């Protein structure tokens, strides 16, 4: 009966969960963790990553 309101709540929660999940994406870099990038590379290539 109350599918419309629950649907709106689901879309908002799902969008937030996807946005949080996207931090786990390398995006074509060696790692998804910034601290690792500093701890492992020189600034000329770390800047690129």
């Amino acid at each position: 009966a109350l599918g419309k309101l629950q649907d709106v709540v689901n879309h908002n929660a799902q969008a937030l969960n996807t946005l949080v999940k996207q931090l786990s994406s390398k995006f074509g870099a060696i790692s998804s963790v910034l601290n690792d990038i500093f701890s492992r590379l020189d600034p000329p290539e770390a800047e690129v990553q």
């Binding site: 963790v33 601290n35 690792d36 500093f38 701890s39």
Partner: peptide, 18 residues
């Protein structure tokens, strides 16, 4: 290795993980 502190905001380095 340094000592561990509880309930305070610190910048830690555990085995290369910052």
């Amino acid at each position: 290795s340094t000592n561990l502190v509880k309930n305070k905001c610190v910048n830690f380095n555990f085995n290369g993980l910052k």
